[PDB]
């Protein structure tokens, strides 16, 4: 009725602070590991060159 309640009350602030920091850490990780991926596609010049070769030119 008296002791354990008081010590729980004393614990509350530190735990709240640490959990807030942990959540911030996880969202920070979410944004950190995002990168824009630029894909590379076969240049159409080679396609045009192959078309010319097929024509026997």
């Amino acid at each position: 009725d008296i002791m354990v309640p008081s010590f729980v009350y004393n614990k509350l602030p530190v735990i709240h602070f640490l959990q807030e920091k942990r959540a911030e850490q996880k969202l920070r990780r979410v944004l950190d590991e995002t990168y824009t991926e630029w894909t590379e596609e076969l240049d159409q010049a080679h396609v045009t060159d192959a078309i010319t070769r097929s024509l026997n030119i």
């Binding site: 192959a50 070769r53 097929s54 026997n56």
Partner: protein, 268 residues
């Protein structure tokens, strides 16, 4: 009963009709003449274009049909032919050089090209050994575009020939073509890499000599005749009939071709 397979590759209908009339009139109906697009034996291909299923494109100077201008010449021109795909699809001779530029993998195509060159090299060295020559002449177009197909062709042809013990001399397309047309007695055996220019050179030599029939060695194993003109087709048919086991008919066709090139059918 027997069958002769006619392949058409860029040949005008007149030549095909002439060939059909010649065989029908000479054979007399004993051997039927069917038309197709691919064969391995008892086949005559009409037209400059290369058919599907041929890996070697040898041609010689037959003694009987020697033109008076080219009397006594003896030179064998063998053109290496890579496997031919559908017209729409990219041919190997072009794929092997464009894919490398594009960065695409070129392992299977290299393997197929290597096999074709080895077979062509084996045919060329066999002809050289039979004729007794010690050195053969490789022909590669020196264009920058064909900087990969020719490189593989040289790397493999020289390897096989040197393994056989004969010498190889590499040359371009213009110099060899001029030499072959002007002074062909200085060349015994000439191999040609698979390019459009080489195909034209082979046709020009086959025609300038007086009109001859080219021999194509196929993957299945065998020899098929090839012609592009009235006289060349007539000689090709005569050789084909000789292979079937007809000597008198073959001689008659050969004589008719020698006398009246453009109208052999009426001549005989």
């Amino acid at each position: 009963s027997k069958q002769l397979t006619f392949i058409s590759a860029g040949a005008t209908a007149a030549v095909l009709q002439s060939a059909s009339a010649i065989v029908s009139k000479v054979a007399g109906g004993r051997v039927q003449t069917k038309t197709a697009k691919e064969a391995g034996r008892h086949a005559v291909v009409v037209g400059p274009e290369t058919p599907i299923g041929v890996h070697t494109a040898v041609t010689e100077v037959p003694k009987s049909a020697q033109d008076p201008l080219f009397s006594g010449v003896s030179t064998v021109v063998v053109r290496a032919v890579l496997p031919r795909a559908a017209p729409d699809s990219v041919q190997l001779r072009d794929a092997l050089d464009v894919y490398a530029s594009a960065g695409i993998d070129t392992k299977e195509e290299v393997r197929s090209a290597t096999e074709a060159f080895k077979k062509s090299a084996e045919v060329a060295v066999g002809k050289a050994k039979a004729k007794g020559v010690k050195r053969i002449v490789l022909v590669v177009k020196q264009a920058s575009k064909h900087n990969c197909i020719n490189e593989l062709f040289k790397k493999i042809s020289t390897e096989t020939i040197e393994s056989a013990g004969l010498t190889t001399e590499v040359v371009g397309t213009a110099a060899v073509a001029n030499q072959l047309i002007v002074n062909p007695e200085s060349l015994g055996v000439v191999l040609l890499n698979d390019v459009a220019a080489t195909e034209q050179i082979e046709l020009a030599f086959a025609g300038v000599v007086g009109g001859v029939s080219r021999v194509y060695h196929t993957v299945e194993g065998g020899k098929i005749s090839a012609g592009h003109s009235f006289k060349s087709v007539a000689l090709a048919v005569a050789q084909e009939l000789r292979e079937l086991g007809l000597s008198s008919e073959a001689d008659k066709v050969e004589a008719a071709a020698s006398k009246n090139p453009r109208a052999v059918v009426s001549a005989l």
